[PDB]
């Protein structure tokens with residue numbers, strides 16, 4: 830689990846969105862595994878606007894933050910899971926790092942701010958849904 834709280838937005842994995850998220854929906858995209866809802870309170874996270882390929886992510890299954898090198902946002906084939914059939918997921922970045930299914934939502938960050946959230950993984954890999962291209966999160 831986990832979310833980004835920037836301005837009056839809450840960014841979560843679409844597969845983990847609650848009823849309140851759907852009832853306060855701003856934007857969702859199944860192909861990216863992302864959903865954004867509106868919040869009453871202002872958040873403290875800032876979004877990175879950069880092309881960093883190194884950063885640090887939070888892994889809840891280890892209660893630890895790890896440094897990682899990650900690929901550029903791309904279209905990658907993701908195996909079938911309890912929440913989606915096998916399909917191509919867009920705007921996904923891959924890295925070598927530990928992950929388990931419930932690690933989804935953990936933040937990946939760089940020197941500039943939040944880069945994205947854990948969305949996929951397995952066998953010593955971890956994938957992150959990028960949010961750096963969503964410029965509207967800043968206003």
Ligand SMILES: COc1ccccc1CC(=O)N1C[C@@H](C(N)=O)CC12CC2
Pocket residue numbers: 844862907910911912913918928929930931932933947948949950951952
């Ligand atoms: C962090 O993901 C994993 C880690 C280890 C093993 C397997 C996974 C992948 C996984 O379980 N996925 C991929 C998600 C997606 N974005 O399609 C949907 C979801 C069920 C939760």
Ligand SMILES: [Zn+2]
Pocket residue numbers: 877878879880881939940941942
């Ligand atoms: Zn950066």
